[PDB]
Amino acid sequence: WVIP
Amino acid sequence: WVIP
Amino acid sequence: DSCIQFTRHASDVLLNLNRLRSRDILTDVVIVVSREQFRAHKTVLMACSGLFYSIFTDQLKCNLSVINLDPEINPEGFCILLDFMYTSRLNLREGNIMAVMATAMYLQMEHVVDTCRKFIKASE
Amino acid sequence: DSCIQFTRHASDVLLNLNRLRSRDILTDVVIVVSREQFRAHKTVLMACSGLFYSIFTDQLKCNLSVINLDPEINPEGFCILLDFMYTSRLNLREGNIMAVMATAMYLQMEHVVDTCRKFIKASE
Ligand SMILES: N#Cc1c(Cl)ncnc1Nc1ccc2c(c1)CC(=O)N2
Ligand SMILES: N#Cc1c(Cl)ncnc1Nc1ccc2c(c1)CC(=O)N2
Ligand SMILES: [Cl-]
Ligand SMILES: [Cl-]
Ligand SMILES: [Cl-]
Ligand SMILES: [Cl-]
Secondary structure: OEOO | OEOO | OOOEEOOOHHHHHHHHHHHHHHOOOOOOEEEEEOOEEEEEOHHHHHHHOHHHHHHHHOOOHHHOOEEEOOOOOOHHHHHHHHHHHHHOEEOOOOOOHHHHHHHHHHHOOHHHHHHHHHHHHHHO | OOOEEOOOHHHHHHHHHHHHHHOOOOOOEEEEEOOEEEEEOHHHHHHHOHHHHHHHHOOOHHHOOEEEOOOOOOHHHHHHHHHHHHHOEEOOOOOOHHHHHHHHHHHOOHHHHHHHHHHHHHHO
């Protein structure tokens, strides 16, 4: 999971 | 396009 | 093999599947969550959820145009997860995390359950 | 928004769509290319091809279960492109490049046409  |  | 790969292809396919969903094009099922209805493509639901994969590979249920979810399922939680299925983006907030996690557990979406557990553990 | 994103989601969705295609699950159209037949999902075809997007948004053609392609279309070229649609991988070879490019032009798959043009220009 990432900060898009 | 890339070499996968 | 000696194939070349187009990096953005999978993301572009999903963007177009979401555009089709928004315009209600070739949607083949309505998911009923208490008073709310959500139109979707069975193939996308199966590709994202262990529960839908089970439902639509069933010889009788594969032909249904309406699927009613358990009454304990929160419609907003379902909406957030349906958006995630079609975009890879999860709108996870303090106010919805418990509903999102419970819905992801029911829908059998392991990666979502995992990030919800991690975000909850960090706040305790 | 304040969304989080699951990097591999789009790729995992496409992998599952390909698994459904391989098992002939919820495929809703057969593409006929001269003596050859290819089963697929209309939504994936529309999401990858300008030609299929046009065909399946048509009020009459959207309901067809069989689509016959132009007799000049090479089945191997179509097969390579159908595999690309479901995997992001293009099996581009000296022996098939002309057929692949001609098929990609007909199917309106701009990124494939682009790499074929570039590979051809490098060999001249
Ligand atoms: N459609 C399809 C499908 C196929 Cl073909 N093969 C394997 N899994 C499929 N989908 C599916 C099954 C289980 C789970 C998910 C998706 C996400 C998750 O957390 N569990
Ligand atoms: N399904 C869908 C779809 C939608 Cl909803 N919106 C916009 N394009 C869509 N698909 C589509 C249209 C044109 C082309 C491609 C795909 C690849 C390409 O080279 N040309
Ligand atoms: Cl029904
Ligand atoms: Cl997931
Ligand atoms: Cl027909
Ligand atoms: Cl393309």
